[PDB]
């Protein structure tokens, strides 16, 4: 099958690491960071890696029952059935993949009356009570029956300023009980001139001076597209050109490594300047020795 | 181009009328209802109708500034730029398309300190202050600077029991100022044996005895797929067969009208029983006189 990327504009896409839309394109120096994101990890061939699942709305949500202590939720699977700690994944597909406090809201229904309730609730993925893999997560909930399906819908990050969140620091899915399992390989631009092309959004902040940025390596729909299509990597890198349908002109080119990350020939930071109508286009499969035309 | 539907299982898909995953397949009697949903309306040929946009995470969100009175938000566009009441759409793409109270949370950042805040907030789309089209929406917010980007993230519906929400009753996007503009055509099964095949989810409830169901005519990804693909309607109806990859057997067939709705040959209600691994498959283009093999 022939390879393609979706004709979606950045603003028409969604961040694969938090349920919010993409806002911009950005690139900066990697060196000092880790870049082990587990969400938004997909082989361009179609292979989902890490904790990556297809739904953009289920990223960072948690379902299950809860028991009052601030509150512990014995996790269930997205579809509300039993959690299987057996699978060979880092944690439930869609689990958060950075260390931080995520404010949201807990909601439950009592199968009995049609009765319902809702309360604010936060979750620190740094806390040693953040054990998704093992099957339980603790909410520092800022009246909650047991044996009743509870759901957590994420909203933003409530986080000395800018310190949290720690976007490139992976939480411990098994917490204290053990190291992380079956992680997606870490990313780093290898070629000389090149740097990494991120896909940034701004997680809403919910109280405090949090570092609201959030970069992802692949848009949620690229993940959804490689999954459907499953186009053979007729090469180890795919040359992408970011076109503009208004002027009909190419702005910059970039590298889509079949592994699942994007690199752009640039040194130093830069909030990528682009036309709201521009989108990426698959031109050709190239060797990893292909030097890219510099970026703006 | 040849027509297709995505190989996604119901649970792998998302509801196109609220940012939550699909849960089940359902069918019941239409007659007494309207069925004028504006979200999840797409021509199978690729034409988005009503207030339908591509992002499943931006359904029911509102951005803009707010001014304390409980609170009014002068709407902005998804990308945070000016709202254009000029476009020939019923309202901002993604606006809610049923009458009800939607609880969620308002969050804002103050460009100045990195300062942030968050408070619960509800919105009644029945209220005469619900004027999306005109550019303003009022929150009955259950400390909010002005001239500061505020966002509303929806969570569930806080709604004598079961009365609200009114899933098939369209809100007035211009409120009192005028009737609704450029609506997606209403739906109804025309053929004799047939009924309408919905795609149901359960909006979380956030306080009260709300009618948490929510049916949509097309999964958000079918909408995203017809948009990419844009496969010519070589006919006015497309025969779909819901297969099971485990047993390799067809369960039931259904009608995908190029208009953008699904009909199944059945009379009376029924929570469709299906294997978690089953998915739909495009078999052939047929005439509207094709009688369907009854459904379970």
Coordinates of C-alpha atoms in Angstrom, one line a residue:
Chain A
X1 CA 0.0 0.0 0.0
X2 CA 1.3 3.5 -0.8
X3 CA 2.2 5.8 2.2
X4 CA 0.4 9.0 3.1
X5 CA -0.2 11.4 6.0
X6 CA -3.5 13.1 6.6
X7 CA -4.5 16.3 4.9
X8 CA -5.3 18.0 8.2
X9 CA -4.0 21.3 9.3
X10 CA -2.3 21.6 12.6
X11 CA -5.3 23.4 14.2
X12 CA -7.5 20.6 12.8
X13 CA -5.6 18.0 14.7
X14 CA -5.4 16.8 18.3
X15 CA -2.6 16.4 20.7
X16 CA -1.9 12.7 21.4
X17 CA -0.8 13.3 25.0
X18 CA -3.8 15.2 26.4
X19 CA -7.4 15.5 25.1
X20 CA -7.1 18.9 23.6
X21 CA -6.4 20.3 20.1
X22 CA -3.0 21.0 18.6
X23 CA -2.2 24.6 18.5
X24 CA 1.4 25.0 17.1
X25 CA 4.5 23.5 15.6
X26 CA 7.7 23.9 17.7
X27 CA 11.3 22.7 17.7
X28 CA 14.1 23.1 20.2
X29 CA 17.3 21.4 21.6
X30 CA 16.8 17.8 22.9
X31 CA 20.1 16.9 24.7
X32 CA 19.1 17.7 28.3
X33 CA 15.8 15.8 28.2
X34 CA 14.5 12.3 28.1
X35 CA 11.7 12.1 25.5
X36 CA 10.1 8.8 26.4
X37 CA 6.5 9.9 25.8
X38 CA 4.3 6.7 25.9
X39 CA 1.1 8.3 24.3
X40 CA 1.3 9.3 20.6
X41 CA 3.8 6.5 19.8
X42 CA 3.1 4.7 16.6
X43 CA 5.1 3.1 13.9
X44 CA 4.3 4.8 10.6
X45 CA 3.8 1.3 9.4
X46 CA 0.8 1.1 11.8
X47 CA 2.2 -0.4 15.1
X48 CA 1.1 1.3 18.3
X49 CA 3.8 1.5 20.9
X50 CA 3.8 2.4 24.6
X51 CA 0.4 3.2 26.2
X52 CA -1.0 4.5 22.9
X53 CA -4.6 3.8 22.1
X54 CA -6.7 5.3 19.2
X55 CA -9.2 7.5 21.0
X56 CA -8.1 11.1 21.5
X57 CA -10.9 11.6 24.1
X58 CA -9.8 8.7 26.3
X59 CA -6.3 10.1 26.8
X60 CA -5.8 10.7 30.6
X61 CA -9.3 9.4 31.7
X62 CA -9.7 6.8 34.4
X63 CA -12.7 4.6 35.1
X64 CA -13.5 2.2 37.9
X65 CA -14.9 2.1 41.5
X66 CA -13.6 4.4 44.3
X67 CA -13.4 4.0 48.0
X68 CA -13.3 6.9 50.5
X69 CA -10.2 7.2 52.7
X70 CA -8.2 11.5 49.7
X71 CA -9.8 8.8 47.5
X72 CA -8.6 5.6 45.8
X73 CA -10.0 4.3 42.5
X74 CA -9.5 0.6 41.7
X75 CA -9.2 0.9 37.9
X76 CA -11.4 -0.7 35.3
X77 CA -10.8 -0.8 31.6
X78 CA -12.1 1.8 29.2
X79 CA -15.1 -0.4 28.3
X80 CA -15.8 -0.7 32.1
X81 CA -14.8 -4.4 32.3
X82 CA -12.0 -5.9 34.4
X83 CA -8.4 -4.5 34.4
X84 CA -5.8 -6.9 33.1
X85 CA -2.4 -6.1 34.7
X86 CA -1.2 -9.0 32.6
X87 CA -0.9 -7.3 29.2
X88 CA 2.5 -6.4 27.9
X89 CA 2.0 -2.6 28.0
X90 CA 3.5 0.1 30.4
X91 CA 0.1 0.7 31.8
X92 CA -3.5 1.0 30.8
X93 CA -3.6 2.4 27.2
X94 CA -4.0 6.2 27.5
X95 CA -2.5 6.6 31.0
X96 CA -0.8 10.0 31.5
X97 CA 2.9 9.9 30.4
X98 CA 4.6 12.8 32.3
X99 CA 4.9 13.7 36.0
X100 CA 2.4 16.2 37.2
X101 CA -0.8 17.1 39.0
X102 CA -3.8 16.8 36.8
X103 CA -7.0 18.5 37.9
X104 CA -10.3 17.2 36.5
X105 CA -13.6 16.0 37.9
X106 CA -14.8 12.7 39.2
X107 CA -18.4 11.7 38.3
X108 CA -20.4 8.7 39.3
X109 CA -23.8 7.2 38.8
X110 CA -25.5 4.9 41.2
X111 CA -27.1 2.1 39.1
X112 CA -30.0 2.3 41.4
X113 CA -31.9 5.7 41.2
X114 CA -30.3 7.3 38.1
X115 CA -28.7 9.2 41.0
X116 CA -25.6 11.2 40.1
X117 CA -22.8 13.4 41.6
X118 CA -19.7 15.3 40.7
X119 CA -16.8 16.7 42.6
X120 CA -13.5 18.3 41.6
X121 CA -10.5 16.0 41.9
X122 CA -6.8 16.1 41.2
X123 CA -4.2 13.3 40.7
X124 CA -0.5 13.5 41.1
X125 CA 1.3 11.1 38.8
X126 CA 4.4 11.7 40.9
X127 CA 2.7 10.4 44.1
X128 CA 3.7 6.9 45.1
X129 CA 0.0 6.1 45.1
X130 CA -0.1 6.5 41.3
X131 CA -0.1 2.9 40.4
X132 CA -2.0 2.6 37.1
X133 CA -0.3 -0.6 36.0
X134 CA -1.0 -2.3 39.3
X135 CA -4.6 -1.1 38.9
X136 CA -5.2 1.8 41.3
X137 CA -4.9 5.6 41.3
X138 CA -5.3 8.1 44.1
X139 CA -7.2 11.4 43.7
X140 CA -6.5 14.3 46.1
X141 CA -10.2 15.3 45.5
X142 CA -10.5 19.1 46.1
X143 CA -19.9 12.0 49.3
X144 CA -18.9 9.2 46.9
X145 CA -20.5 5.8 47.2
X146 CA -18.6 2.5 46.7
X147 CA -19.3 -0.3 44.3
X148 CA -20.5 2.4 41.9
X149 CA -18.9 3.2 38.6
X150 CA -16.8 6.4 38.9
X151 CA -15.1 8.2 36.1
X152 CA -12.4 10.8 36.0
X153 CA -12.5 13.3 33.2
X154 CA -9.3 15.4 32.9
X155 CA -9.4 19.2 32.4
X156 CA -6.0 20.8 32.8
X157 CA -2.9 20.9 35.1
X158 CA -2.9 22.6 38.5
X159 CA 0.8 23.1 39.3
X160 CA 8.6 28.7 42.6
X161 CA 6.9 28.9 39.2
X162 CA 6.8 26.8 36.0
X163 CA 8.4 23.9 37.8
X164 CA 5.5 21.4 37.2
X165 CA 4.5 19.7 35.1
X166 CA 7.5 17.7 34.1
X167 CA 6.5 16.8 30.6
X168 CA 9.5 14.6 29.8
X169 CA 9.7 12.7 33.0
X170 CA 7.7 9.4 33.0
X171 CA 5.7 8.6 36.1
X172 CA 6.2 5.2 37.6
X173 CA 3.2 3.2 36.5
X174 CA 3.8 0.5 39.2
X175 CA 4.9 3.2 41.6
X176 CA 7.1 1.7 44.2
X177 CA 6.3 -1.9 43.4
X178 CA 8.6 -2.0 40.4
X179 CA 10.3 -0.3 37.3
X180 CA 8.4 0.6 34.2
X181 CA 7.6 -2.2 31.7
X182 CA 7.5 -2.3 27.9
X183 CA 8.1 1.4 27.3
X184 CA 8.1 2.9 23.8
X185 CA 11.7 3.6 22.8
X186 CA 13.0 7.1 23.7
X187 CA 13.5 9.7 21.0
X188 CA 16.5 11.8 19.9
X189 CA 17.4 13.5 16.6
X190 CA 20.6 11.7 15.4
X191 CA 21.5 13.5 12.2
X192 CA 23.9 16.5 12.5
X193 CA 21.9 19.6 11.3
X194 CA 18.6 18.2 12.6
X195 CA 16.4 18.7 15.6
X196 CA 13.1 17.4 16.7
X197 CA 9.8 18.7 15.3
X198 CA 7.2 18.7 18.1
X199 CA 3.4 19.2 17.9
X200 CA 2.5 21.5 20.8
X201 CA -0.7 22.5 22.6
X202 CA -1.3 24.4 25.9
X203 CA -2.9 22.3 28.6
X204 CA -5.3 24.5 30.4
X205 CA -4.0 25.5 33.8
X206 CA -6.4 25.0 36.7
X207 CA -4.9 26.9 39.7
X208 CA -1.2 28.1 40.1
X209 CA 1.7 28.8 37.8
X210 CA 2.1 25.5 35.9
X211 CA 4.1 24.9 32.8
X212 CA 1.1 24.5 30.5
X213 CA 3.0 23.5 27.4
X214 CA 2.7 19.9 26.1
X215 CA 4.5 18.6 23.1
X216 CA 3.7 15.3 21.3
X217 CA 5.7 13.5 18.6
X218 CA 2.7 12.6 16.4
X219 CA -0.8 14.1 16.1
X220 CA -3.5 11.8 17.4
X221 CA -4.9 11.5 13.8
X222 CA -1.5 10.6 12.3
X223 CA -1.7 7.8 14.9
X224 CA -5.2 7.0 13.8
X225 CA -4.3 7.1 10.1
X226 CA -1.1 4.9 10.3
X227 CA -3.3 2.4 12.2
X228 CA -6.0 2.2 9.5
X229 CA -3.7 2.4 6.4
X230 CA -0.7 0.5 7.6
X231 CA 1.5 1.6 4.8
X232 CA 4.8 -0.4 4.5
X233 CA 7.9 1.6 5.3
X234 CA 9.6 1.3 1.9
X235 CA 12.4 3.2 3.7
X236 CA 13.6 4.1 7.2
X237 CA 12.7 7.8 6.9
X238 CA 9.9 9.6 5.0
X239 CA 10.4 13.1 3.6
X240 CA 7.5 15.4 4.4
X241 CA 6.8 18.8 2.9
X242 CA 4.6 21.3 4.8
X243 CA 2.6 22.9 1.9
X244 CA 0.2 25.9 1.9
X245 CA -3.0 25.5 -0.1
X246 CA -3.5 29.3 -0.4
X247 CA -0.2 30.1 -2.1
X248 CA 0.4 26.6 -3.3
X249 CA 4.0 26.8 -2.0
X250 CA 6.2 24.5 0.2
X251 CA 7.3 26.2 3.4
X252 CA 9.7 23.7 4.9
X253 CA 10.4 19.9 4.7
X254 CA 10.8 17.5 7.6
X255 CA 11.7 14.0 8.6
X256 CA 9.1 11.4 9.5
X257 CA 11.1 8.4 10.8
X258 CA 9.2 5.2 10.3
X259 CA 9.8 4.8 14.1
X260 CA 7.3 7.5 14.9
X261 CA 8.9 10.9 15.4
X262 CA 9.5 14.0 13.3
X263 CA 12.8 15.8 12.8
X264 CA 13.5 19.2 11.2
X265 CA 16.9 20.6 10.0
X266 CA 17.3 23.5 12.5
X267 CA 19.4 24.4 15.6
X268 CA 18.1 26.3 18.6
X269 CA 14.4 27.0 19.6
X270 CA 11.7 28.5 17.4
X271 CA 7.9 28.7 17.6
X272 CA 7.2 27.6 14.0
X273 CA 5.5 30.3 12.0
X274 CA 2.9 28.8 9.6
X275 CA -0.3 29.6 7.7
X276 CA -3.5 28.2 9.4
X277 CA -4.3 26.4 6.2
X278 CA -1.0 24.6 5.8
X279 CA -0.7 20.8 6.1
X280 CA 1.9 18.1 5.6
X281 CA 2.4 16.0 2.5
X282 CA 4.3 12.8 1.8
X283 CA 6.7 13.4 -1.0
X284 CA 9.2 10.4 -0.9
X285 CA 11.0 7.7 1.1
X286 CA 14.6 8.6 1.6
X287 CA 17.8 7.4 3.3
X288 CA 18.7 8.6 6.8
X289 CA 21.7 10.4 5.2
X290 CA 19.3 12.9 3.4
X291 CA 20.2 16.4 4.6
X292 CA 17.1 18.6 5.0
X293 CA 16.7 22.1 3.4
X294 CA 17.0 24.3 6.5
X295 CA 13.9 25.5 8.2
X296 CA 12.9 29.2 8.4
Chain B
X1 CA -12.1 6.4 -5.3
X2 CA -13.5 3.2 -3.8
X3 CA -15.8 3.5 -0.7
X4 CA -14.9 2.2 2.8
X5 CA -15.8 2.6 6.4
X6 CA -13.1 2.4 9.1
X7 CA -12.1 -0.9 10.7
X8 CA -12.7 0.3 14.2
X9 CA -14.8 -1.5 16.7
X10 CA -17.6 0.4 18.4
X11 CA -15.7 0.7 21.7
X12 CA -12.7 1.9 19.7
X13 CA -14.8 4.8 18.4
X14 CA -16.0 8.1 19.7
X15 CA -19.4 9.7 19.9
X16 CA -19.7 12.7 17.6
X17 CA -22.1 14.6 19.8
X18 CA -20.1 14.7 23.1
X19 CA -16.3 14.2 23.7
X20 CA -16.7 10.6 25.1
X21 CA -16.2 7.1 23.6
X22 CA -19.0 5.1 22.0
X23 CA -20.3 2.4 24.2
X24 CA -23.1 0.6 22.3
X25 CA -25.3 0.2 19.2
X26 CA -29.0 0.8 19.7
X27 CA -32.2 1.1 17.6
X28 CA -35.7 2.2 18.5
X29 CA -38.9 3.9 17.1
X30 CA -38.3 7.4 15.5
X31 CA -41.9 8.7 14.9
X32 CA -42.3 10.9 18.0
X33 CA -38.9 12.6 17.8
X34 CA -37.2 15.2 15.7
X35 CA -33.6 13.9 15.0
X36 CA -32.0 17.1 13.8
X37 CA -28.6 16.5 15.4
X38 CA -26.1 19.1 14.0
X39 CA -22.9 17.3 15.2
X40 CA -21.9 14.1 13.6
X41 CA -23.5 15.1 10.3
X42 CA -21.4 14.2 7.3
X43 CA -22.1 13.2 3.7
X44 CA -20.5 9.7 3.1
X45 CA -19.1 11.5 0.1
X46 CA -17.2 13.7 2.5
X47 CA -19.4 16.8 3.0
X48 CA -19.7 18.0 6.6
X49 CA -23.1 19.4 7.5
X50 CA -24.6 21.3 10.4
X51 CA -22.1 22.3 13.1
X52 CA -19.9 19.3 12.5
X53 CA -16.1 19.8 12.7
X54 CA -13.4 17.1 12.7
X55 CA -12.0 17.1 16.3
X56 CA -13.7 14.8 18.7
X57 CA -12.1 16.7 21.6
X58 CA -13.5 20.1 20.6
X59 CA -17.2 19.0 20.7
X60 CA -19.0 21.1 23.3
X61 CA -16.0 23.3 24.3
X62 CA -16.2 27.1 24.3
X63 CA -13.3 29.6 24.3
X64 CA -13.2 33.3 24.7
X65 CA -13.1 36.1 27.3
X66 CA -15.6 36.2 30.2
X67 CA -17.1 39.1 32.2
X68 CA -18.5 38.7 35.7
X69 CA -22.1 39.6 36.3
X70 CA -23.6 34.2 36.7
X71 CA -21.0 34.8 34.0
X72 CA -21.0 35.6 30.2
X73 CA -18.3 34.5 27.8
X74 CA -18.0 36.5 24.5
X75 CA -17.0 33.6 22.3
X76 CA -13.8 33.2 20.2
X77 CA -13.0 30.6 17.6
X78 CA -11.4 27.3 18.4
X79 CA -8.0 28.7 17.4
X80 CA -8.6 31.7 19.8
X81 CA -9.1 34.2 17.0
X82 CA -12.2 36.3 16.3
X83 CA -15.6 34.8 16.0
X84 CA -17.3 35.2 12.6
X85 CA -21.1 35.2 13.0
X86 CA -21.0 35.6 9.2
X87 CA -20.4 32.0 8.1
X88 CA -23.2 30.0 6.8
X89 CA -23.3 27.5 9.7
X90 CA -26.0 27.0 12.5
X91 CA -23.4 28.1 15.0
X92 CA -19.7 27.7 15.9
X93 CA -18.6 24.2 14.6
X94 CA -18.9 21.8 17.6
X95 CA -21.6 23.7 19.5
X96 CA -23.9 21.4 21.6
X97 CA -26.9 20.2 19.6
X98 CA -29.6 19.2 22.2
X99 CA -31.3 21.2 25.0
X100 CA -29.8 20.6 28.4
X101 CA -27.6 21.7 31.3
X102 CA -23.9 20.8 30.7
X103 CA -21.7 20.9 33.7
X104 CA -18.0 21.3 33.1
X105 CA -15.2 23.6 34.3
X106 CA -14.0 27.0 33.3
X107 CA -10.2 27.6 33.2
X108 CA -8.2 30.7 32.5
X109 CA -4.7 31.9 32.3
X110 CA -3.6 35.5 32.7
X111 CA -1.0 36.2 30.0
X112 CA 0.8 38.2 32.7
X113 CA 2.1 35.9 35.6
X114 CA 1.5 32.4 34.2
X115 CA -1.3 32.8 36.8
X116 CA -4.1 30.3 36.5
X117 CA -7.5 29.4 38.0
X118 CA -10.4 27.0 37.7
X119 CA -14.0 26.8 38.8
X120 CA -16.9 24.6 38.2
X121 CA -19.4 26.0 35.7
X122 CA -22.6 24.8 34.1
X123 CA -24.4 26.0 30.9
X124 CA -28.0 25.6 30.0
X125 CA -28.5 25.5 26.2
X126 CA -32.2 26.1 26.9
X127 CA -31.6 29.4 28.6
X128 CA -32.3 32.5 26.4
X129 CA -28.7 33.5 27.2
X130 CA -27.4 30.6 25.1
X131 CA -26.6 32.6 22.0
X132 CA -23.6 30.8 20.4
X133 CA -24.3 32.0 16.9
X134 CA -24.5 35.6 18.0
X135 CA -21.3 35.0 19.8
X136 CA -22.0 34.7 23.6
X137 CA -22.9 32.0 26.1
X138 CA -23.8 32.3 29.7
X139 CA -22.5 30.0 32.5
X140 CA -24.3 29.5 35.7
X141 CA -20.9 28.9 37.4
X142 CA -21.4 26.7 40.4
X143 CA -12.7 35.3 40.8
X144 CA -12.4 35.5 37.0
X145 CA -10.4 38.3 35.4
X146 CA -11.6 39.9 32.2
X147 CA -9.6 40.4 28.9
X148 CA -8.2 37.0 29.8
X149 CA -8.6 33.8 27.7
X150 CA -11.1 31.6 29.3
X151 CA -12.0 28.1 28.2
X152 CA -14.8 25.8 29.0
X153 CA -14.1 22.0 29.1
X154 CA -17.3 19.9 29.2
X155 CA -17.6 17.0 31.6
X156 CA -21.2 15.6 31.8
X157 CA -24.8 16.6 32.2
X158 CA -26.3 17.8 35.5
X159 CA -30.0 17.4 35.1
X160 CA -39.2 14.7 38.4
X161 CA -36.5 12.4 36.9
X162 CA -35.0 11.6 33.5
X163 CA -36.6 14.8 32.0
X164 CA -33.4 16.5 31.0
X165 CA -31.5 16.4 28.7
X166 CA -33.6 16.7 25.7
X167 CA -31.3 15.0 23.2
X168 CA -33.5 15.5 20.2
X169 CA -34.5 19.0 20.8
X170 CA -32.2 21.6 19.2
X171 CA -31.3 24.7 21.2
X172 CA -31.7 28.1 19.7
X173 CA -28.3 29.2 18.6
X174 CA -29.4 32.8 18.2
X175 CA -31.6 32.4 21.2
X176 CA -34.4 35.0 21.1
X177 CA -32.8 37.1 18.3
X178 CA -33.9 34.6 15.6
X179 CA -34.6 31.1 14.2
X180 CA -31.9 28.6 13.5
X181 CA -29.8 28.9 10.3
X182 CA -28.4 26.4 7.9
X183 CA -29.4 23.3 9.9
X184 CA -28.4 19.7 8.7
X185 CA -31.5 18.0 7.4
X186 CA -33.5 16.0 9.9
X187 CA -33.3 12.2 9.8
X188 CA -36.1 9.5 9.6
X189 CA -36.1 5.9 8.4
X190 CA -38.2 5.9 5.2
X191 CA -38.3 2.2 4.2
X192 CA -41.0 -0.1 5.6
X193 CA -39.2 -2.7 7.7
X194 CA -36.4 -0.4 8.7
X195 CA -35.5 1.7 11.7
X196 CA -32.6 3.9 12.6
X197 CA -29.3 2.5 13.9
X198 CA -27.8 4.8 16.5
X199 CA -24.4 5.0 18.1
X200 CA -24.9 5.4 21.8
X201 CA -22.7 6.5 24.8
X202 CA -23.6 7.6 28.3
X203 CA -22.7 11.2 29.1
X204 CA -21.5 11.2 32.6
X205 CA -24.1 12.7 35.0
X206 CA -22.7 15.4 37.3
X207 CA -25.5 15.9 39.9
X208 CA -29.2 14.9 39.7
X209 CA -31.2 12.3 37.8
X210 CA -30.4 13.2 34.2
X211 CA -31.1 11.1 31.1
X212 CA -27.5 10.3 30.5
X213 CA -28.0 8.5 27.1
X214 CA -26.7 10.2 23.9
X215 CA -27.1 8.8 20.5
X216 CA -25.3 10.0 17.4
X217 CA -25.9 9.0 13.7
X218 CA -22.2 8.6 12.7
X219 CA -19.1 7.8 14.8
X220 CA -16.7 10.7 15.0
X221 CA -14.1 8.7 13.1
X222 CA -16.5 7.8 10.3
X223 CA -16.9 11.6 10.0
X224 CA -13.1 11.9 10.0
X225 CA -12.8 9.1 7.4
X226 CA -15.4 10.3 4.9
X227 CA -13.7 13.7 5.1
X228 CA -10.2 12.3 4.2
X229 CA -11.2 9.7 1.7
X230 CA -14.2 11.5 0.0
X231 CA -15.4 8.4 -1.8
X232 CA -18.1 9.1 -4.5
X233 CA -21.5 7.8 -3.7
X234 CA -21.8 5.3 -6.6
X235 CA -25.3 4.9 -5.1
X236 CA -27.8 6.5 -2.7
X237 CA -27.4 3.8 0.0
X238 CA -24.4 1.7 1.0
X239 CA -24.9 -1.8 2.4
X240 CA -22.9 -2.4 5.6
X241 CA -22.3 -5.8 7.2
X242 CA -21.2 -5.9 10.9
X243 CA -18.6 -8.7 10.9
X244 CA -16.9 -10.5 13.8
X245 CA -13.1 -11.1 13.4
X246 CA -13.1 -13.9 16.0
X247 CA -15.7 -16.2 14.4
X248 CA -15.3 -14.6 11.0
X249 CA -19.1 -14.4 10.7
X250 CA -21.6 -11.6 9.7
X251 CA -23.9 -10.7 12.6
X252 CA -26.3 -8.2 10.9
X253 CA -26.4 -5.9 7.9
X254 CA -27.3 -2.2 7.8
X255 CA -28.0 0.8 5.6
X256 CA -25.5 3.7 5.4
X257 CA -27.4 6.3 3.4
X258 CA -25.0 8.6 1.5
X259 CA -26.8 11.4 3.4
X260 CA -25.2 10.4 6.7
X261 CA -27.4 8.1 8.8
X262 CA -27.6 4.4 9.5
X263 CA -30.8 2.3 9.2
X264 CA -31.4 -1.3 10.3
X265 CA -34.3 -3.6 9.4
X266 CA -36.0 -3.9 12.8
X267 CA -39.2 -2.8 14.6
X268 CA -39.3 -1.8 18.3
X269 CA -36.3 -1.0 20.7
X270 CA -33.2 -3.2 21.4
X271 CA -29.8 -2.7 22.9
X272 CA -27.8 -4.3 20.1
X273 CA -25.9 -7.3 21.4
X274 CA -22.4 -7.5 19.8
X275 CA -18.9 -9.0 20.2
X276 CA -16.4 -6.3 21.5
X277 CA -14.3 -7.1 18.5
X278 CA -16.9 -6.7 15.8
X279 CA -16.7 -3.9 13.2
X280 CA -18.5 -2.7 10.1
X281 CA -17.6 -3.5 6.5
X282 CA -18.6 -1.9 3.2
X283 CA -20.0 -4.7 1.0
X284 CA -21.8 -2.9 -1.8
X285 CA -23.8 0.1 -3.1
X286 CA -27.5 -0.7 -3.4
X287 CA -30.8 0.9 -4.4
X288 CA -33.1 2.3 -1.7
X289 CA -35.5 -0.5 -2.4
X290 CA -33.1 -3.1 -1.0
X291 CA -34.8 -4.9 1.9
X292 CA -32.5 -5.8 4.7
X293 CA -32.1 -9.2 6.3
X294 CA -33.7 -8.7 9.7
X295 CA -31.6 -7.8 12.7
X296 CA -31.4 -10.1 15.7

